[PDB]
Design a protein around this ligand. Structure first.
Ligand SMILES: *Cc1cc2c(cc1C)nc1c(=O)[nH]c(=O)nc-1n2C[C@H](O)[C@H](O)[C@H](O)COP(=O)(O)OP(=O)(O)OC[C@H]1O[C@@H](n2cnc3c(N)ncnc32)[C@H](O)[C@@H]1O
Ligand SMILES: *Cc1cc2c(cc1C)nc1c(=O)[nH]c(=O)nc-1n2C[C@H](O)[C@H](O)[C@H](O)COP(=O)(O)OP(=O)(O)OC[C@H]1O[C@@H](n2cnc3c(N)ncnc32)[C@H](O)[C@@H]1O
Ligand SMILES: *Cc1cc2c(cc1C)nc1c(=O)[nH]c(=O)nc-1n2C[C@H](O)[C@H](O)[C@H](O)COP(=O)(O)OP(=O)(O)OC[C@H]1O[C@@H](n2cnc3c(N)ncnc32)[C@H](O)[C@@H]1O
Ligand SMILES: [Cl-]
Ligand SMILES: [Cl-]
Ligand SMILES: [Cl-]
Lengths: 550, 550, 550
């Protein structure tokens, strides 16, 4: 194809067209779309940010390219190094809230790995693991287990939604709710295409499977893996796998992600916290039970607007452009039979043990007045515990999407600071953030996910993607929240295309020692800067901080 | 000081002497000893391998240098880059079995970080963590907790011996026995001196603590850390902390290692497996209970000679140069009231729960004939369960050292392959190894440590460091075992100075993609090759594979 | 000399000693002092900061070297480029409040240009200018005019104190009180030794004086200048003279600074502003009279503590460690017959014109209640108007030093933000700063100097250089004030050795475009980084931001 709306840096039109042609020849006309509107969580867009904060085509691809297999990826990379064309690799592109399929650098080629590279490569029962390609979404993994009847032996671990890529999420260091929630910490042996085009397999993935007739002559991409590949992440020597998470270090072709065997028992529940101020004691409560294991999976403490929101649009709670007052929340909270702050968790294993865990949990939370316990049964058909019920057992849903719906053309943007598991610290953070959401004229909506000795505070910024004034308040809110929290000793864990530089600038101990070490490693392996420049604020030297940052 | 026995590559004598003098001026005459015999686990040697396989001075330092604080380290590194002098950083030097304090490259300066850099920087109770300097050994950490009465709130996690460095062990990706056994996976935020001399703090360690009077003007080495430093290892962006384990990437000045709160209950035990062949069913038994959590800490399956050995010298079991026969083992096993294979584990938490866990464990192992359960009580004063009892609760010992004593001038050397948690695979591996120990004329002695979906097979090679013929059989055994296991799809997790190249050559999938990626990263950050060249077989380009490997 | 306390980067001791010897041979043993306490405004120290905020020897010289003439400077620079020794050029070293004689980089050689290079090169009456060497202080210039009877034709322009260098002050873009106060804007044609060692003369200084017998064969340093050198700063082409102010671009050997002819009339005065809040209207008052010229020189608006302070130690006003309250100020103000805010100015020229100017000024200030006008006559012998009287006519003093005396071992540190000439903006700034001085436990003391369309807010931080706790509060105050003002759209005009990086980081529009442009220019001309690295936060590339900034 002929003439894009946007060309990558320094590339002439003829060069775009030459590269472009070589590629049609590699992948098929069908595997490429040059770009001369947003879409659906259901039929996601690859060209840009659908939940866009900046201008719609602000971050935009020059062309979309679908590798049919690992070889193509090696081919595109060779060509990208020839022309100095930057690549923006995505698995599924559902990173909405963080940018979606959009590239940090506009005019880049978007590589949707997931279209043709969809395979469940293996589900190992004794080893209790699966091996996967980017196109493998969570629902897909589920359906794979169902139709192969694996449901009874092994459980999945899902984030709030069903359409994400098991792989991409893991690279982002994503999170889910079972005891296997730390996604990234669950991986073992992965394969990546380096910037040079060469294939690499990490850990025990480097120890080659022994030779045999059946396996002779297969392309490396195609070789089976050694016995320990997916059971011990370390392998031998420097443990380099992390340079692959939230980095521009390579293209991930496959990965092993550990699976939880059916636990022999499961009980999910809700505990409503009546007062806004209760977040305080609840957190001090959650603290020792988490370190101690009465608390198993990653439990979550939700704010009322989030459940109110899965339930209905702002408009069906109040016709007020303004943010709802603290009294209107208490009202909604009551109508819903929920609290100010809502706690979801789940029990795992023999009833005899669940029994004892629950007696302990139920007892600790009791120091909180007006506290109330429920089981899915004990609640309505449209309840959130009902949904999260499936969620805490590895079963995929999409009901949570309706929360994005609070506003007319709602779009989400995530502020994702981390806080200690201290009522005090959590209260402090909620304050700082809440206040600012206010000055911006927005309802504060959020949830803290309970790590073992840390918490992920996911502030859900919802806004009308069609309101310039607002969209502008959102960029002001963000950058401000970012500075305020850092001022308080807290930094974000993951972020959107537009705040990467800002957030990385936050991580400045000792004159930016961290970005600098990072820069040195990226230039070594990506001398031509072709793979995702700017990601996490890491820039190839070919990219000017003056021209590039934001 | 004047004239070493061995000079690093290409350095003239005058240069040695100049560098050497600059350094006395930096650290004090007292912090340095130029080298113009082996010693004790109790008073370890810094100059070379005490448990030496090769010739005694085979791997040897030119001088020993003790930095008084992080600044010195920055100073020595600047000087080392001036003269191109290689550094060999050690915390405590107890890596006997792997080389001890000895440097891969002889003539290097040995840096004992641990002498002056001994401090417990912090023990955080709410956060359930400690922050440490290299000189901090395990006993020391223990005594620190005792004398500050912290014993009742938090538990340590120790490897078999008490003298190691909490830090150094962790970098090596060492292992211990409580539920917090994966040492490395327990760290959060560490500080390292890069090859360039610049300071770096990982993860949330990069998010700087906010400013305040009390903290103004302190050297960076000296600044407190942000609130989340030690509670969430990830921070933001590429997770680079692993380039710091078993690598030549930097000098570790400090590290945060997570602590287990007193569990409210603990019960340790032993289960004797009568037949040599029982390893098979036991492993298939251990398998689902480990994935499921009836098995908590890292349990261990020991071979009889190991307990026989903590108990007494080969000489007090039999005067036979030859290896003891399979019948003599069954005899020793009986005299000791132990099995062929011995299983140690421990229970944690409320009796009500331990109760249920133990009923399940006790019941599974019963399909094994002649099986027998014991509690420390149920056994003698000199028993191993008695020792491991302290061990599985974080309490430090040294009784296990006597096993090194099997032979007259016993020295240990570790073959450390990894095997699946399959009776079949474990049996296969034990075979291959056992056979070879035989052809070498040596008693096979070993233990498998139970990971969750993998096992660490620690083969304990004991030999007389004073017997040339033998020492030679040992090098033959090793290199052979190394090739045989790889041929079987298994590779080692950690190794001695002398087998690093060999072992790394094993990890060759796709034309050595792994060592090559590694090499590229090291040259970038260590353009002058000054930090530990050759470690894990990773060589700076200034170092010739032809001249350097083994 | 033998062995310094501190060596510059990467220099060996022998190298220090070699360089050092070459230099004794160039300048005389007498012109050099190697350093193997603070001193006096009267006998200033060249080795470090006397008014030190950080640790005393924090910023410190390796050796002090006194060039006897421009050739030596060319010689030292050649040697400094040989060894890569950094130079820290000072004229007189009275930059106390900003660091004094101390070098940004410790171990640098301090060059006191002023000792041997003291000459008044010319005082041109028709052209109304003087030409000078660094050692030429203000008193000296005065005495030069007196003893050559030039007092009646031309007037000097002095800052608050008499000991500064006319030259050094100008480079710093210093300020004084007559109509010729913008020191830097008063210069024409200067001479500098480039980093390469070559001599340069700016503007019309490049147009060579025509040839003649009398002038034949003189060294260039020694050649007279063309007729227009000191009368039109521009010359022809790029006007590069500014790369010489507050920069590391070169060593200034001489400079032409324009002189004000005796005006034919002079009247100085004071106007007391009764209320703290009066700063507001007064500034709105000063505004149009300044743009219009009823206001001539640079008038100053002082805070009461400053006059109180020239008058007496905190101790003789109150024994209170705490800061004096707003009521105690009103008291002091009354005892002194002064206001809350005090305004000093001076009239110039024919009485007939002064007459009209004064009627206008006197009339505008009258909208302020309790306002009062005075002439030196109308006030006491120890008054500040009495001192500033000489000051506003170019006559040098030192009475103002006593203000440094507020505290026991008082030391000053200047926060020097700039504010609009708006009551509103000035009030806002005073607020922000005042508040912080409070949280630090310090009396706020300051003065705004009236530029024509801007004001220099000189906040005078006085502290006890011998109090660690305090010294620490001072560093906290500073860095905080720095961030707060920038947050308010205001940045500092000049600063201390310790806040240069911080302040430059403030000037970040468009990804730091400014420091970057600057860096590019410095490396070009100072490829070896030998001249003042770090000044104004500008670092040679040989200097690591990670190792260097603060
Ligand atoms: C809107 C929303 C989002 C959301 C959520 C709830 C709602 C209402 N709940 C989340 C949760 O509970 N946990 C979580 O981790 N994320 C949550 N999200 C955000 C988002 O939906 C998920 O993170 C989602 O799984 C991510 O989108 P997807 O999985 O489709 O990933 P992607 O768009 O392909 O992007 C991945 C990013 O990582 C890098 N990447 C991706 N693929 C590769 C390959 N092959 N190689 C190298 N890097 C890769 C890129 O940086 C890409 O941008
Ligand atoms: C003889 C023996 C050994 C042993 C054991 C039982 C016996 C009888 N049981 C072990 C166990 O249960 N678990 C385990 O991990 N190791 C076991 N060992 C082996 C050994 O004793 C321990 O691993 C011991 O803790 C290690 O010795 P030490 O802790 O003193 O470490 P070191 O000699 O200082 O060496 C550490 C190596 O790692 C790198 N290193 C060390 N310090 C630094 C710093 N500051 N910066 C960067 N790298 C560092 C070096 O490569 C050094 O060689
Ligand atoms: C304590 C104090 C200070 C003060 C003041 C009142 C008090 C109580 N009032 C001031 C005023 O009204 N106006 C003003 O400009 N400054 C005021 N100060 C501060 C200080 O005393 C003066 O600025 C003083 O004139 C500066 O000290 P000095 O004149 O001795 O300068 P120096 O120490 O030599 O430093 C000059 C700096 O500029 C660069 N420099 C100096 N010489 C050279 C040469 N030859 N070549 C290149 N650069 C040069 C250096 O950066 C040096 O640090
Ligand atoms: Cl999701
Ligand atoms: Cl040990
Ligand atoms: Cl002055």
């Amino acid at each position: 194809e002929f003439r894009p709306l946007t060309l990558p840096p320094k590339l002439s039109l003829s060069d775009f067209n030459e590269f472009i042609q070589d590629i049609i020849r590699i992948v098929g006309s069908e595997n490429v779309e040059v770009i001369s509107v947003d879409g659906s969580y259901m039929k996601p867009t690859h060209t840009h940010d659908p939940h866009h904060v900046m201008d719609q085509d602000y971050f935009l691809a020059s062309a979309i390219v679908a590798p049919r297999n690992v070889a193509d990826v090696q081919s595109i990379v060779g060509l990208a190094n020839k022309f100095s064309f930057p690549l923006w690799p995505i698995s599924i592109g559902r990173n909405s809230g963080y940018g979606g399929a959009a590239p940090r650098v506009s005019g880049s080629v978007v590589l949707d790995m997931g279209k043709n590279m969809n395979r469940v490569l293996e589900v190992n029962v004794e080893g209790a693991y699966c091996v996967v390609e980017p196109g493998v979404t969570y629902h897909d993994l589920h359906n794979y287990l169902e139709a192969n009847n694996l449901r009874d032996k092994l459980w999945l671990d899902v984030p709030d939604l069903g359409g994400g890529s098991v792989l991409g999420n893991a690279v982002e260091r994503g999170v889910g709710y079972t005891p296997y929630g730390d996604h990234w910490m669950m991986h073992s042996g992965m394969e990546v295409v380096l910037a040079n085009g060469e294939l690499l397999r990490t850990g025990m993935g480097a120890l080659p499977d022994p030779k045999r007739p059946e396996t002779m002559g297969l392309k490396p991409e195609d070789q089976p893996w050694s016995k320990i590949a997916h059971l011990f992440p370390y392998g031998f020597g420097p443990y380099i796998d992390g340079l692959f998470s939230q980095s521009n270090m390579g293209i991930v072709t496959k990965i092993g992600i550990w699976l939880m065997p059916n636990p022999r028992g499961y009980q999910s529940y809700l505990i409503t916290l009546p007062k806004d101020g209760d977040l305080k004691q609840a957190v001090d409560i959650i603290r020792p039970l988490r370190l101690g294991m009465a608390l198993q999976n990653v439990p979550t403490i939700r704010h009322i607007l989030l459940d109110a929101a899965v339930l209905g649009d702002k408009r069906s709670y109040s016709s007020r452009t303004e943010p709802l007052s603290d009294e209107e929340l208490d009202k909604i909270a009551k109508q819903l039979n929920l609290g100010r702050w809502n706690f979801y968790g789940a029990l795992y294993g023999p009833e005899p043990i669940r029994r004892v865990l629950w007696e302990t949990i139920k007892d600790a939370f009791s120091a909180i007045p007006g506290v109330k316990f429920y089981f899915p049964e004990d609640t309505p058909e449209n309840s959130v515990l009902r949904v999260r019920d499936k969620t805490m057992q590895g079963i995929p849903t999409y009901d949570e999407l309706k929360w994005i719906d609070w506003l007319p053309n709602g779009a989400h943007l995530f502020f994702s600071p981390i806080a200690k598991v201290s009522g005090e610290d959590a209260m402090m953070q909620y304050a700082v953030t809440k206040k600012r959401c206010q000055e911006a004229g927005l309802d504060f909506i959020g949830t803290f996910t309970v790590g073992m000795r840390e918490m992920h505070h996911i502030v859900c910024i919802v806004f009308n993607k069609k309101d310039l004034i607002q969209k502008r308040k959102v960029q002001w809110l963000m950058r401000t929240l970012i500075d305020d929290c850092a001022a308080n000793g807290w930094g974000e864990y993951r972020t959107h295309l537009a705040f990467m530089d800002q957030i990385m600038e936050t991580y400045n101990w000792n004159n930016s020692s961290f970005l600098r070490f990072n820069e040195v490693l990226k230039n070594a392996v990506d001398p031509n800067g072709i793979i995702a420049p700017g990601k996490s604020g890491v820039w190839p030297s070919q990219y000017s901080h003056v021209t590039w940052k934001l």
